[PDB]
Amino acid sequence: SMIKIHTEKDFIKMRAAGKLAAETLDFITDHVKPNVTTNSLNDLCHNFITSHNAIPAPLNYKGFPKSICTSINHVVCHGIPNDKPLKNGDIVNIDVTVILDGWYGDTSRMYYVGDVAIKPKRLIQVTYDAMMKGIEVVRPGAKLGDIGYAIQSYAEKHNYSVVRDYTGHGIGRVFHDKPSILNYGRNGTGLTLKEGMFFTVEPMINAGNYDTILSKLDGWTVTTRDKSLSAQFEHTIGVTKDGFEIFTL
Numbered sequence: 001s002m003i004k005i006h007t008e009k010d011f012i013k014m015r016a017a018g019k020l021a022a023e024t025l026d027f028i029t030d031h032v033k034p035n036v037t038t039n040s041l042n043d044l045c046h047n048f049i050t051s052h053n054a055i056p057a058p059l060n061y062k063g064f065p066k067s068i069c070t071s072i073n074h075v076v077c078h079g080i081p082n083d084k085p086l087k088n089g090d091i092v093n094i095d096v097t098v099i100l101d102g103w104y105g106d107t108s109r110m111y112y113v114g115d116v117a118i119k120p121k122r123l124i125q126v127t128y129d130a131m132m133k134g135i136e137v138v139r140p141g142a143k144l145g146d147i148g149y150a151i152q153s154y155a156e157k158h159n160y161s162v163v164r165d166y167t168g169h170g171i172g173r174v175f176h177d178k179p180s181i182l183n184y185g186r187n188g189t190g191l192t193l194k195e196g197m198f199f200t201v202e203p204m205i206n207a208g209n210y211d212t213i214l215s216k217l218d219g220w221t222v223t224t225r226d227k228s229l230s231a232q233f234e235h236t237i238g239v240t241k242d243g244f245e246i247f248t249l
């Protein structure tokens with residue numbers, strides 16, 4: 001597979017798209033509360049994005065019917081906004097992608113709905129830290145499998161499981177580009193990271209068993225086979241002379 005190598009001019013564009021994607025996530029926070037629907041949140045983020053001269057990449061992407069993904073509780077990823085009210089104690093991932101001047105910024109976060117219990121809180125914390133362990137190996141000369149190994153080792157040694165079938169990806173003027181960034185792997189295996197690569201790191205971590213099911217009904221929604229909670233965070237990153245840069249802050 002072909003890995004695109006980027007110039008400084010491209011980093012500039014990615015910083016702007018990343019920032020706008022981050023700010024959308026900052027913006028929606030105060031709106032997440034009990035008895036709000038994910039449809040309301042979708043419209044909020046949709047209008048935030050378009051009023052900043054940008055396009056929501058998920059809208060009609062391979063038919064996806066909405067502008068953001070909202071994944072509640074045992075939903076693992078790509079949950080579709082709907083009319084169901086959020087409940088006190090729920091956890092939700094909101095995943096945004098903006099296209100700004102032709103360049104994609106892709107990021108997701110976990111949100112608490114009302115007062116959340118200790119177990120959900122611990123799951124979210126380990127997920128965030130596992131993501132960061134993956135990002136922290138990134139530098140020219142490190143190997144792609146180093147990323148998945150850091151994530152997997154951290155999650156599993158904290159007593160959680162790693163979702164295998166859905167991955168990070170290259171990104172830039174394209175939403176999903178080469179290579180796949182697996183969230184599991186053996187250390188020191190796979191292609192060599194080079195200065196100027198852009199990609200996402202987006203691990204999904206389950207409280208129960210690692211096994212997931214894709215909805216045949218809507219074709220998008222992934223849930224845990226065992227109905228245990230799952231959490232995810234995502235950043236878009238770039239490889240620099242000194243390691244990594246996170247664009248989605």
Ligand SMILES: [Mn+2]
Pocket residue numbers: 095096097106107108234
């Ligand atoms: Mn995303």
Ligand SMILES: [Mn+2]
Pocket residue numbers: 106168169200202234
């Ligand atoms: Mn992504």
Ligand code: NA
Pocket residue numbers: 071072073074075076077091093229230231232
């Ligand atoms: Na979830």
